[PDB]
Design a binder for this molecule. Structure first.
Ligand code: 6WZ
Length: 349
C-alpha cells in the first residue's frame, strides 16, 4: 500500500501516466496506429533529427520541388496522422523548430516508457514505490510554513508577467528533489560566481525522463537552427514564462515546473537569435536579454544561491527580441535541480 506521502504518490502517478504520453504524441500530430508508444525508439528519433537537419540545410540555401523529397523522408521515419493525406510541406524555419520540439518530447517520453517496460514485476509491491525507485531521485514534501516555502511562493507570486495574465497560478505542492549523483556532477561549479535559482517548465510527460536522466541537451543530430540560442538547457527568471511551456489547458490544468541551481558565471549577453555550437572563450552561459527583468535590488539568497524574485521592471535594453530574460547553459553539469512544484492553472478565458 506504499508509505510515501500522498503528494509524492500523486506526482508519480502523474509523470508515469501512459495515457498522458499518448495524448502528448497526438498533440504533436503523430499517428499512434503506425507509431505507437511501444514502437518508439532512440535510433528512430535520432534518425528523424538527422532528416530534420537535412531540411534545415535546404531551407538555409533556398525550391518546393527539391524540399518535397526531404519533407516526405521525415514523415517516413515519424508517421503523422493524415489518413490518405498528402501531408503539409516542411519548408521553413518554423517547421524545423516545431518538429524539433516534437522530437525533444519524444526523447523524454521514450525514456519514461522504457523505465516502465524494463525492470521487474512483483504484485506484492505497490507500483507507486516501484516506479518511484526508477527515478533515482529523493523526493520530499516541503512544509508549507518553512522558510524555503515562503521564498518559493514569493518567487511565484512576484514574477508572473502582465503579458501572461490569461491564467493565474496556484502552488499545490512544493517538493525538494535530489537526483542521484547530481551533487557530485555539480561539484566543479558549486562555488562559481553568478549561481542563480531559475525556472524550467516542461510538460508533465517529460518529467520521468528529466528526473531519471537530468535536464539534457538536444543531441548532435538535432538542427541547431531549431533552438534560438543553440542546443543548451534553457531557464527563465519569470515563473509565467516557464509556466507557458507546461502546455496546460482548461481540460488539463495541472502542471509541473522545476527550480534549478544554475551556474551561469560569466554570461554572454545576446539580444537576438544566435545558433551557436559553443560559447566564446571565458563565457560559462548565455543570457538572452529581456526588455523586462526582476528588480535587482529585491534579490534574496536561499542556501547561498541568488533568487531573483523582484517584481518586473524595465531592464533598459532597447532592440531585443525578448520580452523577458532567458538563461542557457551548454554543459549539463552546470545544473543542480533543487525543487519541483505542482501548479494549478486557473484560466480566466
Ligand atoms: C529540456 C531539454 C533541454 N531543452 C531546453 O532547455 C529548451 C527549452 C526550450 C523551451 N523552454 C522550455 O521548455 N521551458 C522553459 O522554462 C524555458 C525557459 C526559457 C526559454 C525556453 C524554455 C527551448 C529550447 C531548449 F533547448 C530542449 C529539450 N530537452 C533536450 C532533450 F534532448 F532532452 F530533448
Amino acid at each position: 500500500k506504499s508509505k510515501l506521502p500522498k503528494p509524492v504518490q500523486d506526482l508519480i502517478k502523474m509523470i508515469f501516466d501512459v495515457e498522458s504520453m499518448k495524448k502528448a504524441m497526438v498533440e504533436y500530430e503523430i499517428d499512434l496506429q503506425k507509431m505507437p508508444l511501444g514502437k518508439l525508439s532512440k535510433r528512430q528519433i535520432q534518425a528523424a533529427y538527422s532528416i530534420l537537419s537535412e531540411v534545415q540545410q535546404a531551407v538555409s540555401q533556398g525550391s518546393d520541388s527539391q524540399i518535397l523529397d526531404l519533407s516526405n523522408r521525415f514523415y517516413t521515419l515519424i508517421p503523422h496522422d493524415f489518413g490518405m493525406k498528402k501531408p503539409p510541406l516542411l519548408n521553413n524555419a518554423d517547421s524545423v523548430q516545431a518538429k524539433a520540439e516534437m522530437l525533444d518530447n519524444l526523447l523524454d517520453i521514450e525514456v519514461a516508457y522504457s523505465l516502465l517496460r524494463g525492470g521487474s514485476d512483483d504484485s506484492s509491491k505497490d507500483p507507486i514505490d516501484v516506479n518511484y525507485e526508477k527515478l533515482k531521485t529523493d523526493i520530499k514534501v516541503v512544509d508549507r510554513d518553512s522558510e524555503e516555502a515562503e521564498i518559493i511562493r514569493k518567487y511565484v507570486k512576484n514574477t508572473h508577467a502582465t503579458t501572461h495574465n490569461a491564467y493565474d497560478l496556484e502552488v499545490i505542492d512544493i517538493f525538494k528533489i535530489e537526483r542521484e549523483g547530481e551533487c557530485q556532477r555539480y561539484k566543479p561549479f558549486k562555488q562559481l560566481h553568478n549561481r542563480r535559482l531559475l525556472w524550467h517548465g516542461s510538460r508533465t510527460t517529460n518529467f520521468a525522463g528529466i528526473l531519471s536522466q537530468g535536464l539534457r541537451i538536444a543531441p548532435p543530430e538535432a538542427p541547431v537552427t531549431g533552438y534560438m540560442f543553440g542546443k543548451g538547457i534553457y531557464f527563465a527568471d519569470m515563473v509565467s514564462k516557464s509556466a507557458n511551456y507546461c502546455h496546460t489547458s482548461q481540460g488539463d490544468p495541472i502542471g509541473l515546473i522545476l527550480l534549478g541551481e544554475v551556474a551561469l558565471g560569466n554570461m554572454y549577453e545576446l539580444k537576438h537569435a544566435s545558433h551557436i555550437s559553443k560559447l566564446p572563450k571565458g563565457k560559462h552561459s548565455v543570457k538572452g536579454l529581456g526588455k523586462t527583468t526582476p528588480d535587482p535590488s529585491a534579490n534574496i539568497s536561499l542556501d547561498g544561491v541568488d533568487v531573483p524574485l523582484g517584481t518586473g521592471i524595465s531592464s533598459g535594453v532597447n532592440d531585443t527580441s525578448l520580452l523577458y530574460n532567458e538563461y542557457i547553459v551548454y554543459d549539463i553539469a552546470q545544473v543542480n535541480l533543487k525543487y519541483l512544484l505542482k501548479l494549478k492553472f486557473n484560466f480566466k478565458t
